[PDB]
XYZ file of C-alpha atoms in Angstrom:
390
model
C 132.690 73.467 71.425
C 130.971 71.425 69.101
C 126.982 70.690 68.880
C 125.018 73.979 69.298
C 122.328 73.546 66.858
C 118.500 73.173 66.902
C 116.785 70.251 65.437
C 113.277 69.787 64.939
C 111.316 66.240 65.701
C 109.340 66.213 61.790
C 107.156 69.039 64.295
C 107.937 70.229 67.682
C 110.576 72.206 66.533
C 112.987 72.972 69.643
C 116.600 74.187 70.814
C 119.867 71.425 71.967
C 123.110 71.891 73.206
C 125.862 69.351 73.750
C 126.840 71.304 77.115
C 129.235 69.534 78.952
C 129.427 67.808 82.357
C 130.546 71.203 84.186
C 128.897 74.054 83.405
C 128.633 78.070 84.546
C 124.582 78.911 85.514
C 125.833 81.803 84.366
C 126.426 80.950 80.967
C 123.037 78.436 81.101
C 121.071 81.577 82.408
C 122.104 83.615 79.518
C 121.715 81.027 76.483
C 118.220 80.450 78.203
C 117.273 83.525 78.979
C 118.875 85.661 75.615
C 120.171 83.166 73.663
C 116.652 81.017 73.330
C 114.336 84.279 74.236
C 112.716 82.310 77.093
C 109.445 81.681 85.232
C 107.725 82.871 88.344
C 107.995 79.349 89.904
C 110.673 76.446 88.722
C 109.501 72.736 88.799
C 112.061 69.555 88.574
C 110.806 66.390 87.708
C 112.893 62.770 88.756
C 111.960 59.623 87.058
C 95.347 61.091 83.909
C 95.743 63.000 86.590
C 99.177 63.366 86.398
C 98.798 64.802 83.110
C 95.609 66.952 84.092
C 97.941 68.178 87.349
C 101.332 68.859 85.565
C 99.595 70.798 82.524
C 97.254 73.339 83.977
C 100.116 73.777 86.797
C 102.482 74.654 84.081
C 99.802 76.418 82.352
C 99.017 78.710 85.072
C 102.607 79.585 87.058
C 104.018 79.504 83.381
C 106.904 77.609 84.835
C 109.567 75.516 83.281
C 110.042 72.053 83.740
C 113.204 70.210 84.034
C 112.581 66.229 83.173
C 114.914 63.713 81.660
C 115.761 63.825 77.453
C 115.768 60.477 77.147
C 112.141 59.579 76.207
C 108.522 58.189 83.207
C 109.851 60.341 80.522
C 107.689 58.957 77.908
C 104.726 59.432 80.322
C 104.940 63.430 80.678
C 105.530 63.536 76.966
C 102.295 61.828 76.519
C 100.898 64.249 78.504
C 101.956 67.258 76.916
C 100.674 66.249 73.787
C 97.395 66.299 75.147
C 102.869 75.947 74.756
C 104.679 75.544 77.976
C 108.541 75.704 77.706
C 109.687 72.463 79.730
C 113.237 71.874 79.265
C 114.787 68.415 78.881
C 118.317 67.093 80.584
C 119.714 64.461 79.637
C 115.855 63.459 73.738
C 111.990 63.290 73.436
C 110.166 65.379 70.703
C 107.992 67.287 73.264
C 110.198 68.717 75.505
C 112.188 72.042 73.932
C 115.524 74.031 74.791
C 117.593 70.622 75.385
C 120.500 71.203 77.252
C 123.070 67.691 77.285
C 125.787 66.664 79.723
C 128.970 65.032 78.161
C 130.348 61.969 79.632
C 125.574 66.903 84.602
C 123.669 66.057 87.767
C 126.320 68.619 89.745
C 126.213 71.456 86.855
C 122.764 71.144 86.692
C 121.677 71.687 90.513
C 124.423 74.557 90.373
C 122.616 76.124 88.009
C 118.801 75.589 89.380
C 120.622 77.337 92.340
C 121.939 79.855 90.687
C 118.698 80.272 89.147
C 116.788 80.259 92.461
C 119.297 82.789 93.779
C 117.322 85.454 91.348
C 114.703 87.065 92.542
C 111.670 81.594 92.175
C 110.400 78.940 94.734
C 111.607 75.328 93.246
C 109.589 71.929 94.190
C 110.416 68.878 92.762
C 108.228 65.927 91.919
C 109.029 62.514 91.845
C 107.472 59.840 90.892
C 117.077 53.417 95.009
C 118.708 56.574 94.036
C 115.891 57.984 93.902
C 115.273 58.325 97.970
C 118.914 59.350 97.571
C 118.187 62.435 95.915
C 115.159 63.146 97.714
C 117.340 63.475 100.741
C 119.749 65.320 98.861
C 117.542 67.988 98.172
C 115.207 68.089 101.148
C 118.513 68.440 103.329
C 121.126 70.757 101.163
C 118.517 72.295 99.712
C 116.230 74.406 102.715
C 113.648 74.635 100.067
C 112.491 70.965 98.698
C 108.062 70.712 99.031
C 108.700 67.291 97.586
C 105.658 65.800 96.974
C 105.197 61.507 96.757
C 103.330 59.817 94.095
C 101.367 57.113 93.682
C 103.268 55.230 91.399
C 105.463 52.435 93.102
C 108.782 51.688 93.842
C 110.785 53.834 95.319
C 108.872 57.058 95.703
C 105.841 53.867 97.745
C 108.630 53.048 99.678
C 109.552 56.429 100.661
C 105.413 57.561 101.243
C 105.213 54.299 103.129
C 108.218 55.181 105.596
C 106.965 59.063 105.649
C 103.394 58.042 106.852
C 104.500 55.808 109.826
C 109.062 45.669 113.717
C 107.904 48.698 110.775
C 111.300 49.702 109.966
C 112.104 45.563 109.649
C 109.267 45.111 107.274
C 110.488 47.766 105.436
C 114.054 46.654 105.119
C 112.757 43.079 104.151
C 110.302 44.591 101.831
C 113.317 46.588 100.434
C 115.174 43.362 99.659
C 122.882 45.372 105.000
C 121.934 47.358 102.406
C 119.186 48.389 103.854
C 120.405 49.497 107.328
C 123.061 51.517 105.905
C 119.961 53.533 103.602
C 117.788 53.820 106.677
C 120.436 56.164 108.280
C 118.622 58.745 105.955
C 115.323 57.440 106.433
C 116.019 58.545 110.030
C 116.024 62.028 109.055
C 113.218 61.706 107.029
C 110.865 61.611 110.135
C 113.153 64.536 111.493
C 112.439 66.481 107.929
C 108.748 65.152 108.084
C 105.914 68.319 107.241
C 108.215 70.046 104.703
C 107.724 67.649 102.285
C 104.499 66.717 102.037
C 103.021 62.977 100.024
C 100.556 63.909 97.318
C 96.949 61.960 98.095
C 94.654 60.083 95.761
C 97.215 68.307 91.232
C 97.709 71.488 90.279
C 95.665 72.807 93.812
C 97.792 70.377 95.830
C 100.886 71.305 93.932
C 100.238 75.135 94.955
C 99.356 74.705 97.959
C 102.693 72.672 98.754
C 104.577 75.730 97.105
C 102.747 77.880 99.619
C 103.519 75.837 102.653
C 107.141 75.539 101.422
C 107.494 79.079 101.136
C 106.000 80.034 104.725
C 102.932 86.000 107.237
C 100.282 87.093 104.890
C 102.251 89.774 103.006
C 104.763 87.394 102.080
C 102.506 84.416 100.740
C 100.071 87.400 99.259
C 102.886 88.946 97.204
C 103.962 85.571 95.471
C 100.194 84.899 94.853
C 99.496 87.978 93.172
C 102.212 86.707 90.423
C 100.407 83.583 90.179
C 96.502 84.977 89.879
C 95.321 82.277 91.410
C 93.045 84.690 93.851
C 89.449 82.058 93.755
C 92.121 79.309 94.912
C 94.596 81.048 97.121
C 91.974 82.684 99.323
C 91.437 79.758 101.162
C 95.120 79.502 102.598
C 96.789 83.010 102.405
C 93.745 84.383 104.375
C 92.483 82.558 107.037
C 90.931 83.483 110.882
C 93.531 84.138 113.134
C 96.740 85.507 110.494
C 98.641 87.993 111.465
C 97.997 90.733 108.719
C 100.910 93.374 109.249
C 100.112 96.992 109.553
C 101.112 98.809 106.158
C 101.813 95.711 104.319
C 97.861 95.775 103.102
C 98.344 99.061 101.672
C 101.346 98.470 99.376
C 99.891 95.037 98.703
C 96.121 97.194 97.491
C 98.368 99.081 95.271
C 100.293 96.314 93.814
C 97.094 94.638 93.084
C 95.747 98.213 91.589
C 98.847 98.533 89.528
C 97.732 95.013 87.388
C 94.150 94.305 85.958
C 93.363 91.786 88.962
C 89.685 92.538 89.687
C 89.158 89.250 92.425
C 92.214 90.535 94.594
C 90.857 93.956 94.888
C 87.254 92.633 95.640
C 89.312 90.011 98.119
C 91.342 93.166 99.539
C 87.894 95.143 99.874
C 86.366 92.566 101.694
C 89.218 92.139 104.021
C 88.261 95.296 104.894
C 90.375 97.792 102.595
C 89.092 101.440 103.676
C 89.036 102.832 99.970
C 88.276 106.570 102.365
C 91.710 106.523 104.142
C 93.150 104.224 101.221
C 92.686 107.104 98.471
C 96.167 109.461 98.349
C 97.375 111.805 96.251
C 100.827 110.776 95.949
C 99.729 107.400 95.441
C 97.084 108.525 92.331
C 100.041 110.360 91.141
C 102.567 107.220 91.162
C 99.551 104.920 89.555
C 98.877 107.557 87.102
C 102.546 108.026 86.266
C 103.354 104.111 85.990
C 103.399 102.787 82.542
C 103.416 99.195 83.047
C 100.439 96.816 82.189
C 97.505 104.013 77.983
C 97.443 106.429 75.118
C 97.114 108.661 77.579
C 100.773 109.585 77.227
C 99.979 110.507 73.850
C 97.246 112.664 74.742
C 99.533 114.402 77.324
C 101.506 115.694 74.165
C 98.766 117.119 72.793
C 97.780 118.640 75.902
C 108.553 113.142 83.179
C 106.006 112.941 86.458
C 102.288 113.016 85.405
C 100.269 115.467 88.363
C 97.086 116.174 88.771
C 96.593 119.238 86.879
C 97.918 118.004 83.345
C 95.283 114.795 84.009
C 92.462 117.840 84.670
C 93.773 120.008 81.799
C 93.782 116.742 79.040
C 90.064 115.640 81.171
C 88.766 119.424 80.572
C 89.842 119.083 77.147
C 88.146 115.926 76.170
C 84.425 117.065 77.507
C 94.501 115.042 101.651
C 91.874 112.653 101.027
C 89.264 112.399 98.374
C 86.197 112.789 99.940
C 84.746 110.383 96.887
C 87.606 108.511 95.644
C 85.283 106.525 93.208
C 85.093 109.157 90.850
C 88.866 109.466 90.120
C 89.268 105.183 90.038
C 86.656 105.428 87.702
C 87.911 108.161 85.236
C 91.275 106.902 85.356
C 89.800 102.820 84.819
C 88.203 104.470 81.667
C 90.688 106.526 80.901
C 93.066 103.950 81.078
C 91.461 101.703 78.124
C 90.187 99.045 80.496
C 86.919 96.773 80.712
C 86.662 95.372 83.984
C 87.707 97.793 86.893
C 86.029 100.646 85.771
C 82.463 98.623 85.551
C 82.988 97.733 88.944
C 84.042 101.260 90.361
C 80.875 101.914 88.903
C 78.810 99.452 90.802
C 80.037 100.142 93.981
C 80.061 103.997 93.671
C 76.777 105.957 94.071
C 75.460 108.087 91.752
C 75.885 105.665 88.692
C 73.643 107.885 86.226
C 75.985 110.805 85.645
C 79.189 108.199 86.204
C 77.957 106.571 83.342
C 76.977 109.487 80.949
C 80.314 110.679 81.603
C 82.347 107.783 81.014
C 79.639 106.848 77.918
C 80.787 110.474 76.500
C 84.802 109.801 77.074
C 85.084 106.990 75.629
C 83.717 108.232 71.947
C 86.195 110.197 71.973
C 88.877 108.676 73.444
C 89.155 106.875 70.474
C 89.206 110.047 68.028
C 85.180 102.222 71.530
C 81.486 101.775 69.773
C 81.220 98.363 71.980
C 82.329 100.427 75.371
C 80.025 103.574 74.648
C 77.059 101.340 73.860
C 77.288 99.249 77.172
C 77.825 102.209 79.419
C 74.945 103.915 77.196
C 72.570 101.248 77.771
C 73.551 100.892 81.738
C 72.103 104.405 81.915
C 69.174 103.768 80.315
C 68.557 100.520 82.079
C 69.083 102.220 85.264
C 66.190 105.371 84.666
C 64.156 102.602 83.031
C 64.192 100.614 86.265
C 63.678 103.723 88.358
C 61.034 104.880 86.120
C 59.085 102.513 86.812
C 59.399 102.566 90.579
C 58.479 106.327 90.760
């Protein structure tokens, strides 16, 4: 036992344990994940624009990052202070959740395995042992997108051997030490386009995840937890992919489930047929899905949500859909949001009556002034403009 008590840098106040050299990722996985109340991705770090990279990074894929306690430590610390849950092994006042090793290195990558194992792509950044490790993980480890810095020592040495009489400059420039630690280097070349040397972050850093990972529907899917759709559109969908049949459509509806209005424009100009798209088992699972409505409410004042409740509660308030644009729209304002419905209504036709309706709804959804006046206005706008035309 023993330790197992927060203490706060006066503040940076944060989480340690005294764990000891073995440990269960079970046991880790619960004080983390219950225990402290704390990721789509996992970063590992082995020690300006390293800062800039490593914060919006974290930022974005909201990931945790594992870095020595001791305070290159000193360096991301720095950087953080210019509220992402890193986690610190080793005890610098940034970093929170510390987790110790009495005596660590084994009980930790047990547990990032363990960790993995859940349904979590890891890369590790890096800037003697260390080319040890690297091998390590690039090797045991199928999934390793290290990435080299430019910092020197040994993470130089190991760019400079990646990138390319050589290998004896490079053993002098080391200085039979060295021929015994080029056996690795030797599979290096082998292991060469897996793990690939950062150039002189956060784009390059996601885009290594994406190559690590390796078929559009698989790289989409991951993406879509990221939201990183103005960036990832570039790689996931280039000329020539192979774009499954049926993997689009579960993908669209994925997308539709979440309030991700680039995807769906992405999806639609991939060439998503919203006329053979639109189903009515697949209204009735979005309307019946709760995740991401007081509509539920409004269902007990008017167990699976069909159709005919949704037209009862609609009538109230005021297999194909030959104009699907009209339900995405009522259910967009139905559902309380801002963005999909306005563009529902821009694509769909007949915008006048679209947005009387949805002007009308949305006074009294609320028994809402900001929504009713914009949708007002759009109307008006819109006769204005064609008013003076003709």
């Amino acid at each position: 036992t023993d330790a197992f008590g927060t203490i706060e840098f006066q503040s940076n106040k944060a989480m340690y344990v005294r764990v000891s050299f073995d440990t269960k990722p079970d046991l880790l996985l619960h004080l983390m994940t219950k225990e402290w109340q704390l990721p789509k991705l996992l970063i590992s770090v082995h020690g300006q624009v390293f800062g800039k990279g490593l914060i919006k990074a974290a930022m974005t894929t909201g990931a945790w990052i594992f870095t020595g306690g001791v305070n290159v430590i000193r360096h991301v610390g720095d950087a953080l202070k210019d509220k992402i849950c890193t986690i610190g092994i080793a005890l610098n006042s940034m970093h929170s959740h510390f987790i110790l090793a009495d005596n660590e290195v084994k009980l930790r990558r047990q547990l990032e395995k363990h960790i993995s194992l859940q349904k979590v792509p890891v890369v590790a950044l890096i800037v003697p042992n260390v080319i040890s490790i690297v091998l390590e993980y690039l090797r045991d480890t199928p999934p390793v997108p290290v990435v080299v810095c430019d910092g020197s020592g040994r993470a130089s040495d190991i760019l400079a051997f990646g990138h390319k009489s050589l290998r004896d400059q490079l053993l002098v420039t080391i200085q039979t030490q060295a021929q015994h630690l080029f056996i690795i280097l030797m599979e290096c070349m082998k292991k060469k386009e897996l793990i690939t040397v950062f150039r002189m972050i956060d784009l390059a850093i996601l885009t290594a995840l994406l190559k690590g990972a390796n078929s559009a529907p698989d790289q989409l899917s991951l993406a879509l937890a990221w939201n990183r759709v103005d960036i990832a559109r570039s790689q996931i969908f280039i000329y020539g992919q192979q774009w499954p049949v049926g993997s689009l459509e579960q993908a669209m509806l994925d997308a539709l489930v979440l309030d991700r209005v680039d995807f769906v424009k992405l999806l639609i100009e991939n060439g998503v047929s919203m006329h053979r798209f639109l189903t009515i088992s697949r209204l009735e699972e979005l309307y019946n899905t709760r995740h991401g409505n007081t509509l539920y409410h409004l269902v007990r004042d008017v167990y699976r949500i069909s159709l005919i409740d949704i037209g009862l509660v609609i009538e109230y308030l005021m297999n194909h859909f030959p104009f699907p644009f009209h339900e995405l729209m009522v259910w967009a304002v139905l559902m309380k949001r801002q963005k999909m419905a306005l563009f529902f209504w821009q694509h769909g036709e007949e915008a006048m009556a679209k947005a009387l309706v949805a002007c009308k709804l949305c006074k009294a959804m609320a028994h809402l002034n900001h929504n009713s006046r914009d949708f007002g206005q759009l109307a008006v706008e819109l006769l204005d403009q064609s008013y003076k035309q003709d």
